[PDB]
């Protein structure tokens, strides 16, 4: 699991 | 499982 | 601004 | 701006 | 502006 | 601007 | 499953 | 599954 | 500005 | 500015 | 600012 | 599991 | 300025 | 597991 | 400034 | 586990 | 367990 | 277990 916010 | 917000 | 991931 | 992911 | 994946 | 993904 | 809101 | 809102 | 990863 | 990870 | 990393 | 705040 | 990691 | 608030 | 690592 | 804040 | 705050 | 504020 990849969670990202920029 | 890929989540992002840019 | 509001950014989220659930 | 709002972003959501579910 | 609104965005959002369900 | 709405953008919704379901 | 991948998602984007870019 | 891909979803993406550009 | 909110960010939020759940 | 808010930021969050749970 | 607040960064909080649960 | 990763997940970033940038 | 506040940081807190749990 | 890796959190990063940056 | 408040920092904390429980 | 690795938890980081910047 | 790795933790850090910068 | 390395728990690390700068």
């Known amino acids: ?3 990202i916010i920029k």
Do not use: F, N
Request: aromatic share 0%.
């Open 1 to 3: 699991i990849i969670k």
